[PDB]
A = this chain, B = another copy of it.
Amino acid sequence: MNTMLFSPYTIRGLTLKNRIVMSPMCMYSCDTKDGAVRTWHKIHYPARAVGQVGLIIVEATGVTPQGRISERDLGIWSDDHIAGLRELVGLVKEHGAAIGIQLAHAGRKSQVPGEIIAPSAVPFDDSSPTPKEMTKADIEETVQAFQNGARRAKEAGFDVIEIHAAHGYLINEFLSPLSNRRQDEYGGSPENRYRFLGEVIDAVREVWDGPLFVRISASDYHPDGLTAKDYVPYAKRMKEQGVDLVDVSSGAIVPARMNVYPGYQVPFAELIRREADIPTGAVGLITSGWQAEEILQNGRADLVFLGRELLRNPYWPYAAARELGAKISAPVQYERGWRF
């Protein structure tokens, strides 16, 4: 009757109505190819807000044109993006949800034409372009891009900011020795490989004091790569720097075979949560209320992130409530339909 899934959760004064989070998912719907919010986004995101999702994280938003995954990504490299993002924020919040945004940079995995950058001039695979080895100017420049992105998100009115340090993208590339072969202060050791992430966090915190999320790939799924245990010290530091919650994913630094199954990334979320003593978000094949409640009640994570399931059904929270025999507030307009 009284579940944890539909119990409020507060982060730095921001109270989420429940533990349900819409995981950041690229829509590749910027038809103008200028990183601008389009009509699609204005229908896509607010629909989940009506569905009673507590927190909606907007897809990976490129902090630079080269930082995009594709030419159809959302962008935040220009003050001109603020208006569209502000409109999106207004629409989502107006319908009851808190809204966040995922600041991102694809790095060597960018599919945008032209030069792409990485810690080292090593391609993702034999079929990918060789990225440019970033100079220290490029580094502080990219850090500034993240800070500016954060400032624009703040102006747009976002409630939450997430730093995308996962899925083998730019920050993840600095993190993993598989991609980071630098021999300056940005590579060659756990501390050095973390530096870039540390500087991004600090820069963001200069202009942003709201809830701050970091999304990581807890594992590289490679013998010579990173494991969940490597991220425990990193999470402790993130905590000291004022990161509020770790959004725990995994993989994609290089091509690799992964054993995918229900809750396959949950152990990573709990590892960091209990060892680094920091709130975590669980993601990866979470599709049922029954499943989500188990994750919460057993203290494996504090928030549950839903991906593809929210693509199949934007009103998932209602089905989850039914599933758990719980009752939640429905939009007044849908009360006749939302029966418990």
Q: Which residues of A contact B (CB under 8 A)?
A: 3-4, 27-29, 39-40, 43-44, 46-47, 50, 91, 94-95, 259, 261-264, 266-267, 287-288, 290-291, 293-294, 297-298, 307-315, 318-319, 333-334, 336-339
Contact = CB atoms under 8 A, between A and B. Distances in A.
Contacts of A94: 39
A262 B312 contact: no
A267 B91 contact: no
Which one of A94, A294, A338 has the greatest number of beta carbons of chain B within 10 Å?
A: A294
Given A291-B294, A313-B315, A315-B313, A333 B264 contact: no
Contact of A294 (B4, B261, B314): B261
Given A288-B290, A290-B291, A314 B315 contact: yes
Nearest to A325: B339
Given A39-B94, A263-B297, A314-B314, 12 more contacts: A3-B261, A43-B46, A43-B50, A47-B314, A259-B297, A262-B294, A264-B294, A291-B294, A312-B337, A313-B315, A313-B318, A315-B315
A29 B333 CA distance: 8
The count of identical subunits is 4
Nearest to A94: B39
Given A288-B288, A291-B294, A333-B27, A91 B46 contact: no
B297 A333 contact: no
Contacts of A3: 261
A50 B41 CA distance: 12
A241 B261 CA distance: 35
Given A43-B95, A47-B43, A266-B298, A261 B293 contact: yes
Nearest to A264: B297
Given A288-B288, A313-B319, A315-B312, A262 B44 contact: no
Chain A to chain B: the 4 pairs with minimum beta-carbon distance, closest first: A311-B337, A308-B337, A262-B294, A263-B294
B287 A290 contact: yes
